[model samples]
Target: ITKVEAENMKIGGTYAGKISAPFDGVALYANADYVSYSQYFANSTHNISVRGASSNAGTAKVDLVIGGVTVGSFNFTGKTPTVQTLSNITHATGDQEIKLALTSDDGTWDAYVDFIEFSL
Candidate 1:
């Protein structure tokens, strides 16, 4: 897979939402609030990267879920995007879902997911 933007990712939660006026954002206000890439083109890959960050008030911790399994976790503690990558992913020819779910405490996360890119 190439790249899926923040706005196009599927979101779900009571207070979760996306913002794009001033910059890219995905507000994950509570634990389990999340953004995920579902619709995808088929591609074989050995790695993936997620670009995101969190506000100072709320340091976000996210779990990278690939095809319903948690592969890795990362914390976003700043206001700017940092590329966090994980390798050794064995995706075959069909599309797979990648979810970046907030695992922080109930009042501790505002994950701004910019994009997810997968590569061979």
Candidate 2:
């Protein structure tokens, strides 16, 4: 990889699971000062990666909010697998914990966390 491609490459997260929402996928909550980045990339844009994948062949719905506003959302579908890449999605100069959520079902959406990578 060259410098340009390397610059585009990002690290991954460590844990994989529903962040703030409830297990039943009903209750939702958030704190302005809860967002946090991986220690590896805590100082620079180049840090561990944060990704989400689904087991079912259905679509994977994801929504990201920043500063009390919905900034990102989409539906992913693939037989091989669908993964969402959240790079530089969250602000760097805040204590707010970046809330990563995944919904498996559309009708009565259920969440299933595959894995979070802490590798660049």
Candidate 3:
């Protein structure tokens, strides 16, 4: 199993902030046009879980990009805490790069996440 906190991942685009909220540790506050997070993984079939929430009433559109290919997309709505998951995601050694792109359905939405975990 691989676990990564939001503050530990690589971030891009404007309005990505690492703050201490929800927990005493940290979380990533994403409120931009094309915010993303990327990391490396090993070859395996895994389940991905993300602990996060939407800051507004609108849904937040999040996509999983592996080796430059979009594998999955999920929408998160409401301000309630949520744990989103994607199962049976297979990856090869050459295609070990994983990225998540988050975009708000409305400008008022803030896609905030505490951590992400991948388990085989």
Candidate 4:
């Protein structure tokens, strides 16, 4: 597949959203209450990486769902950017739906996604 920039990804949940250029690629949301992304992937175990961070005073929560079930989640508490990974996920053949959802643990906060990648 190709590089999955933030601007090209889909967003969902209870927030007014924005996707913009943050650096070499793109970043999504500043005050997003909740946001999500859905895509299809192959069958087999895959390693996924998401580059993101949060400016929230409290922890920012992000969840990964595959085939309508929660599979992984991460919390970001600082203003530094780093990678979040779901090291292994096995799927069925052909294409399937996988999603990432974001929210905050406290007051209105923001989180971002720079890019997403997958490897088998």
Candidate 5:
């Protein structure tokens, strides 16, 4: 879909909340509001990325959940822009209800998203 706020997500907002996809696979995708298009849109291997307080862009904590349970968490540090991948999440199914929680530690540095997809 187009850029939108995380809170605006109609579903998949919580761990216990499972989003039902009308389509079997390729039913879900992710994007953020008011963020410029970045490498994140083109990069398939990078699951998560962030730009800290210095940039005021990207997310702080990204929660990767599966089947209404928290499978993994990614935390960012400092003002550096970094990328981390949580690979081979065997617990994650093609229909997994993935949720992204973007928070900011410093007000100067806000958070934004480019895109999300299932690589495997």
Candidate 6:
């Protein structure tokens, strides 16, 4: 699997979890929302990354969570997507369910997590 889209993943939300189809297509429009996906990669140190954005950018922060641990924080700006990475994170090579949580961004503010990746 190359680029897993967050909109296609399992999602959990608080306020509003609507996918913004206007400015962005196929991206998570998470107003206090979350998305999770399971990926099977090598049991070595890999850089966990995400691609997302926020409109107003009030609390445009989302955390990369795995094994009940928050490994990285990704902050976005505008409506443009950007990539943020967390390096040297190791895990067992199996079906690891990755969780991306909407840290603080609440209603009217977007904290989107469009993709989650595990790579070197």
Models ranked on lDDT: 1, 6, 3, 4, 5, 2
Q: For candidate 1, lDDT tens digit of each residue in 48-117? A: 7878788664477778877777778767777776888888666435666777877665645567777877
Q: Over the stretch 44-118, how does candidate 2's per-residue lDDT look in tens digits?
A: 232223233334465555454333444455344432323445454444444433343432224323223333333
lDDT of 4 by residue, 24-120 (tens): 3333243343334556655467787877766555555666666666777766556676778878777554555655565433442456666767777
Highest TM-score, which number? Answer: 1
1 or 3, greater by lDDT = 1
What's the best-to-worst order under TM-score? 1, 6, 3, 4, 5, 2
For candidate 6, write residues 67-120 as lDDT tens digits: 667777777766667888788886666677787766653433566555666677
The number of clashing residue pairs in each candidate reads 0, 15, 0, 0, 2, 0
Against the true structure, candidate 4 reaches a TM-score of 0.70
Q: CA RMSD for every model?
A: 2.7, 10.3, 3.3, 3.7, 11.8, 3.3
Whole-model lDDT per candidate: 0.72, 0.33, 0.63, 0.58, 0.34, 0.65
Candidate 3: where are CA atoms >4 Å away? 23-40, 103-108
- Residues 7-67, candidate 3, lDDT per residue (tens digit)? 6667666556565655321332453323344555555577888777766776766767676
Regarding TM-score, does 1 or 4 come out ahead?
1
True lDDT of residue 51, candidate 3: 75
Task: Please give, for residues 16-59, the per-residue lDDT of candidate 5 as tens digits.
Answer: 12222211111112223122111123222323322212122343
TM-score of each: 0.79, 0.39, 0.74, 0.70, 0.39, 0.74
- Rate residue 20 of model 1 by lDDT: 72
User: Which residue pairs show collisions in model 1?
Assistant: none
Q: Better model by lDDT, 2 or 3?
A: 3
TM-score of model 2 (CA atoms): 0.39
Where does model 5 exceed 4 Å of error?
Answer: 1-59, 92-94, 102-111
- Model 6 clash pairs are none
Worst lDDT 10-window in candidate 5: 19-28
Pairs of residues at least 3 apart in sequence or in different chains that clash in candidate 4 = none
